[PDB]
């Protein structure tokens, strides 16, 4: 039928509630206030949704991020006007940089008060314009389902990202009196979507040219990033291709977990803080197959000397770069490409799979590299009798202790040295288990991301590997964890005695001279004040028992490890 | 063309320091990161600046607001690119709404990297456009003095407010190689003057004519050092009763016999009745907010009648021409800085010995209509209004200068009403944006501004939870703030931490009151405690 009457007689708040169900939302992160009251009241006390409350709206925002990254669903945020809205700008910017689907609803002053400098009237659509894929102010209750459907579709398509929908108080309190078009109330499908001959042929041409090229070269590497994780079936098809054509796999920071690092063909992470084996494979390589990765500055060296062996194979028409990329703009934006395969990376891998010649082996490649490893494993000064505890050692031990439980394990982090140590020294096996702020690098991300991930995956063991300065940013959310019941495991690598700011350093043995020390709280007393268990390690001898207790503990728990200040 | 060589050979960082000095800045709030390092290092390393480190950049922003409100000086904020900048959007919007001078410097990716989706490239100029008076991205070290002086001038003139200056790391790291025009280095420096002097004369005439005038005073009187003194001088000279907005509290001594205290929806009846019966309203640095006026068509009926009869009405001393005749039609608008214009007006004011009938009516009202609320009965829970009244007296008996900040919620209004306001720049509260979590970092910044003052944060439990991580910042900064938590948490139920164990974990004394009989002693212990201290009082809902 043309018109939809099902919402007639409902308030905007009740329509919002119905629309969340139609979008298969079962979790909302948010915080009350006068402007959002009509919606908050319709949602907060409803059997249909788990409404998770932070102590600060920024915490709702990062919780929604961790929920989205752990679940593959959009994270939904509900906050009030004015400071409620301006408080979620950092999580929006964070979600925008990392391509995370987030739908932010902000209460607003009534439509009739817009542009009068009313109490808590902020220009939220203007403020959030550069850090959302799209935003809108809803102007009448008739328009509310439309904008909700548009918000969820835009957030979850192309490269996923945050969107904002501004909700004037008079609009959500109003009752819908008349029918509205059915087109505007039904969610988009994007599933069983028809395409034309023209469209089909276009992609298949680029698919054939790349299928023949991989089949050509036999010094290739798969260079994989976050985009392979944006389809349920990405990692499976990635391993399928890796196996079939015996192709070594290296990932970005944001692609960690998309490939089993135990697999003999794993190169692990590449770039500035990546391992030498991966990087050398890339300066070499006649063919880089880039899959859902954007060639960030920290991954590529200088562009010029970056993968010249691939550039030479390109000039000799025998290799180069293939880019499986969903957003045409990011194609040839940083490095110039030979073949572009536009669209969803996983879908295009699938289409391409049959056209791939099964490969025996490459051992001047495979038996090679496998020796690059020996001469360049990750190296750090390891403990000696009496020495301080090394953070890398903590992370390796913790990885093993978590693995021993046989549980699904999800790791979030703060931002800093501990973030890279986590990336490097944990052994990554499963998709959607490393949840870290990579594109914006938001300190304070770790704890609320862990809480939202835990809500997404109640059976998972969720560990926040955090820094002391990062953790201070958002530590009020400890009580949120206790209130939500989420049994997150919060690890603080406390290296407070070295400064936050490097003033200079030795040329070689990176002895760092630093300043700017923050005064930390007592983290164990803090944890107990907030209602959770606190554990502390001061010496090597107690590390193993405390890590075991940390992981074994029922309920949320904080473990502080005092660590050595020099890497 | 006059050229200056004195910065040549300096990095943008040292130039930044020198410009801070010329702007009389000695305090900076902020948080380091890579993009702002060339400037952060210069400021951190110089003993000419007290750099105050929060645990979150939002805390730096609200500290800077507290500092500005307490000192009359702009609050200077220094943060890094990306999330450093986005974390200060709430305090910018807060300062924008409340008209608080603030200069925000954000580190940015190098000029060459703008437009490349670089690590922490945020469009900060775009994000902050609607919550700053002005903002700019500095493009070369040559223009760094110019943009810094421009920023301070704009932040501190007209209606004060926040400005943002985006600093690419290649610009602040660069060494200045060329002479730059001397103008660009020196902080700031007739039909309209005649129209203003005419208005001053007409305003004097109307005031001299009035039989029942009322001064209606808001935040704008606090934006010049001499505002409160001239307000009092005018009130004494012409025997005019004075009511303040919420944001004008402290600008007039509420113990003065001529004080009407606060007007508005939550103001006292006597202030509202005086305004309703006045033949002349003299509005000084106040916005005519609808929480103050109520239904505008019913506001000041006796002043409207006097205007209709050519013998009174409304005078408005207002610095922004856009705010004139925006809400109420006025008989006379005196455009420009209120303090300045009061000073020019003063000699034209007729000294009035008495307004006996008018103050008799006012004093009758004061007796008939005090603030009222259900007070404690035996065994009952403590009332928050009672805590505030008792604490106002205890704080005043210390003999100290006392500054009050608050959170946002019912306690904020109770503080405004039930505290006795005596001195200017002592009520520091988020009114225009109503940002929960304001109270603690604002108190820390106010304490930095006035290290000898007793600084009390009257806070609520939900508001306090927003920014409680800054408790450790108070300890590190050596600011012995007195944090009062009025805990009315028995719809939406939030789990609070144990606030006393929290305070101890953060490094400061924690006190709790649960019963009426404990309250007096604990309030005394609270204000007498030497360092930072948190007192939680469990109150009725
Ligand atoms: C202190 C610090 C140090 C860092 N150093 C490193 C480092 O050493 N090594 C490193 O790798 N990173 C490092 N980074 C992280 C870096 O900033 C980037 O965040 C990261 O490299 C991006 O990885 P990505 O390209 O996989 O993800 P993204 O930035 O999310 O880009 C993914 C690409 O895939 C595309 N895409 C998305 N979905 C799909 C789809 N369905 N199909 C096809 N394409 C899709 C996107 O459009 C995008 O172009 C560091 C971060 C910090 C905070
Ligand atoms: C539920 C609720 C109830 C409230 N109840 C009350 C109440 O009962 N009473 C009350 O007062 N408030 C109340 N408020 C707060 C009220 O809404 C306003 O925030 C407050 O009254 C504004 O104070 P103001 O006009 O002094 O300050 P501002 O809004 O800052 O306005 C100051 C005016 O002075 C001008 N100005 C600035 N500097 C100068 C200068 N140098 N020279 C000349 N002019 C200058 C400005 O341009 C501006 O027009 C309430 C708020 C809420 C949410
Ligand atoms: C919100 C925010 N402010 C500032 C920065 C800049 N910054 C990046 S790492 C870092 C120090 C991190 O300290 P910590 O969390 O203790 O990690 P560590 O390096 O000690 O492991 C800072 C200040 C940032 N990324 N985010
Ligand atoms: C950042 C932010 N989020 C939400 C609101 C909406 N809000 C205004 S008052 C209030 C409750 C205040 O609680 P409390 O701090 O405990 O003060 P109380 O009213 O109990 O005294 C809320 C949620 C706000 N003003 N600011
Ligand atoms: K690893
Ligand atoms: K009072
Ligand atoms: Mg640290
Ligand atoms: Mg409360």
Structure letter (DSSP) for residue B11: B
SS3 content of chain B, % helix, strand, coil (to 5): 45, 20, 35
Backbone angles phi, psi at A16, to 5 degrees: -55, -50
Binding residue numbers of B = 57, 159, 266-287, 318-337, 461, 488, 490
Same domain, A64 and A84: yes
**What's the rounded Cα separation, in Å, for the pair A281 and B222?**
66
Distance CA A290, CA A255 (A): 12
Which residues does residue A134 pair with via DSSP β-bridges, in sequence order? A163
Alpha-carbon torsion (B397, B401, B407, B411), positive or negative: positive
Cβ within 8 Å, pair A131-B127:
yes
B317 lines ligand 2 (CB under 6 A): yes
3-state secondary structure of B334: strand
Last residue of a domain, one of B163, B191, B219: B191
Residues A451, A258: Cα–Cα separation, whole Å: 22
Same domain, A153 and A297: no
**Is there a single domain that holds both residue A17 and residue A131?**
yes
* SS3 per-residue string spanning B206-267: HHHHCCCEEEEECHHHHHCCCHHHHHHHHHHHHCCCEEECCCCCCCCCCCCCCEEEECCCCC
Q: What is the DSSP letter of A251?
A: E
Q: How many CB atoms lie within 10 A of CB A548?
A: 14
* Angle of CA points B432, B435, B437, to nearest 5°: 150
Indicate the residue among A155, A172, A198 that finishes a domain. Answer: A198
Pairing mode, strands B213-217 and B134-137: unpaired
Is the Cβ of A59 closer than 8 Å to some Cβ of chain B?
Answer: no
Written as one string, the DSSP assignment of A466-486 is EEHHHHHHHTTHHHHHHHHT-
Beta pairing class for A512-515 and A501-505 = antiparallel
The structural domain count of chain A equals: 3
- Asked if A478 is an interface residue toward chain B (Cβ–Cβ < 8 A), one would say yes
| Tokens matching residue A418 | 């501990």
**Count of beta carbons in the 10 Å neighbourhood of residue B12:** 27
How far is C-alpha A430 from the chain's CA centre?
Answer: 14
Hey, what are A480's tokens? 């949120």
Domain match, A268 and A230 both:
yes
What is the rounded distance in angstroms from the CA atom of residue B332 to the CA atom of residue B314? 7
A38, A12 Cβ separation under 8 angstroms: yes
Whether residues B271 and B411 share a domain: the answer is: no
Using the Cβ of A483 and the Cβ atoms of chain B, whether some distance falls under 8 Å is answered with yes
Residues recorded for chain A: 567
Secondary structure of chain A: what % helix, strand, coil (to 5)?
40, 20, 40
The CATH number covering residue A119 comes to: 3.40.50.970
Distance CA B410, CA A488 (A): 34
- Same structural domain, B242 and B360: yes
Q: Are residues B200 and B318 in the same domain?
A: yes
Resolution (A): 2.0
For residue B422, which ligand has an atom nearest its CA?
6
Spatial neighbors of B120 by CB under 8 A, at least 6 apart, are: A440, A441, B35, B80, B81, B82, B83, B109
Same domain, A367 and A389: no
Probe residue for ligand 3, chosen from A89, A273, A416 as the CB with the greatest number of ligand atoms within 8 Å:
A416
CB A530 within 8 A of CB A464: no
**DSSP labels for A431-475?**
TT-EE---SS--TT-HHHHHHHHHHH-TTSEEEEEEEHHHHHHHT
Same domain, A187 and A206: no
The parent domain of residue A62 ranges over 1-198
Distance B245 CA to ligand 2 centre (A): 6
Instruction: Count how many Cα atoms sit within 13 Å of the Cα of residue A43 in the half-sphere of its side chain.
Output: 32
Same domain, A234 and A311: yes
The answer to whether B468 and B502 have CB atoms below 8 angstroms apart is yes
- Are B151 and B226 found together in one domain? no
- The strand pairing partners of B50, in sequence order, are B27
Whichever domain contains A228, its CATH number is 3.40.50.1220
Locate all alpha helices (DSSP H) within A104-217, ordered by sequence. 124-127, 144-156, 169-173, 182-185, 197-216
Q: Does A119 contact B476 at a Cβ distance shorter than 8 Å?
A: no
- The minimal CB distance from A483 to the residues B467, B495, B501 is found for B495
B chain contacts of residue A82, beta-carbon cutoff 8 Å: 93, 97, 433-435
Residue A525 parent element (H or E): helix A523-530
B118 touches chain A (CB under 8 A): yes
How many beta carbons lie within 10 A of that of residue A5, not counting itself? 12
- Compute the CA torsion angle B294, B158, B81, B67 (nearest 10 deg): -80
CA–centroid distance, B40 to ligand 3, in Å, is: 14
Domain boundary among A141, A168, A198: A198
Quick one: B243 and B324 in the same domain? yes
Method: X-ray
Give the alpha-carbon dihedral of A389, A390, A395, A397, to 10 degrees. -50
Residues 6+ apart with CB under 8 A from B506: A521, A526, B471, B472, B475
């Amino acid at each position: 039928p043309d018109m939809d009457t099902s919402f007639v007689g409902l308030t905007g708040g009740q329509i919002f509630n119905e629309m969340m169900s139609r979008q298969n939302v079962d979790t909302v992160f948010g915080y009350p206030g006068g402007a959002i009251l009509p919606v908050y009241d319709a949602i907060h006390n409803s059997d249909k949704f788990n409404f998770v409350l932070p102590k600060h709206e920024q915490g709702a925002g990062h919780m929604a991020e961790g929920y989205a990254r752990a679940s593959g669903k959009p994270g939904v945020v509900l906050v009030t006007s004015g400071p409620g809205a301006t408080n979620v700008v950092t999580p929006m910017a964070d979600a925008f940089a990392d391509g995370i689907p987030m739908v932010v609803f902000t209460g607003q002053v009534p439509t009739s008060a817009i542009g009068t400098d009313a109490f808590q009237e902020a220009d939220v659509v203007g403020i959030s314009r550069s850090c959302t894929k799209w935003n809108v102010m809803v102007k009448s209750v008739e328009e509310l389902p439309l904008r909700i459907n548009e918000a969820f579709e835009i957030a979850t398509s192309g490269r996923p990202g945050p969107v904002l929908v501004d909700l004037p108080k008079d609009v959500t309190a109003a009752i819908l009196r008349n029918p509205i078009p059915t087109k505007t109330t039904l969610p988009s499908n994007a599933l069983n979507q028809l395409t034309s001959r023209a469209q089909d042929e276009f992609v298949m041409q680029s698919i054939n040219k790349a299928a023949d090229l991989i089949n050509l070269a036999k010094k290739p590497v798969l260079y994989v990033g976050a985009g392979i994780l944006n389809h349920a079936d990405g990692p499976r098809l990635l391993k399928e291709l890796s196996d079939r054509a015996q192709i070594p796999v290296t990932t970005t920071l944001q692609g960690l977990g998309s490939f089993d690092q135990e697999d003999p063909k794993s190169l692990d992470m590449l770039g500035m803080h990546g391992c030498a084996t991966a990087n050398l494979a890339v300066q070499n390589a006649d063919l880089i197959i880039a899959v859902g990765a954007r060639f960030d500055d920290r991954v590529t060296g200088n562009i010029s000397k970056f993968a010249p062996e691939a550039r030479r194979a390109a000039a000799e028409g025998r290799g180069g770069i293939i880019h499986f990329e969903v957003s045409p703009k990011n194609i040839n934006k940083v490095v110039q490409t030979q073949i572009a395969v536009e669209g969803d990376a996983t879908t295009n891998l699938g289409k391409m799979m049959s056209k791939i010649f099964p490969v025996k082996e490459r051992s001047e490649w495979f038996a090679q590299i496998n020796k690059w490893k020996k001469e360049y494993p990750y190296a750090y000064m390891e403990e000696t009798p009496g020495s301080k505890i090394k953070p890398q050692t903590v992370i390796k031990k913790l990885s093993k202790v978590a693995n021993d439980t046989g549980r699904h394990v999800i790791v979030t982090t703060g931002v800093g040295q501990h973030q890279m140590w986590a990336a490097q020294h944990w052994t990554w096996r499963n998709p959607h288990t490393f949840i870290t702020s990579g594109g914006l690098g938001t300190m304070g991300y770790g704890l609320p991301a862990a809480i939202g991930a835990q809500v997404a995956k109640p059976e998972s063991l969720v560990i926040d590997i955090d820094g002391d300065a990062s953790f201070n940013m958002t530590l009020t959310e400890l009580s949120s964890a206790v209130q939500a019941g989420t049994p997150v495991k919060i690890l603080i690598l406390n290296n407070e005695e070295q400064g936050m700011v490097t003033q200079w350093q030795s040329l070689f043995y990176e002895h760092r001279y630093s300043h700017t020390h923050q005064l930390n709280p007592d983290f164990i007393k803090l944890a107990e004040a907030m209602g959770l268990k606190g554990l502390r390690v001061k010496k090597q001898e107690e590390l193993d028992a405390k890590l075991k207790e940390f992981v074994s503990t029922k309920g949320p728990v904080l473990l502080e490890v005092e660590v050595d200040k020099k890497v």
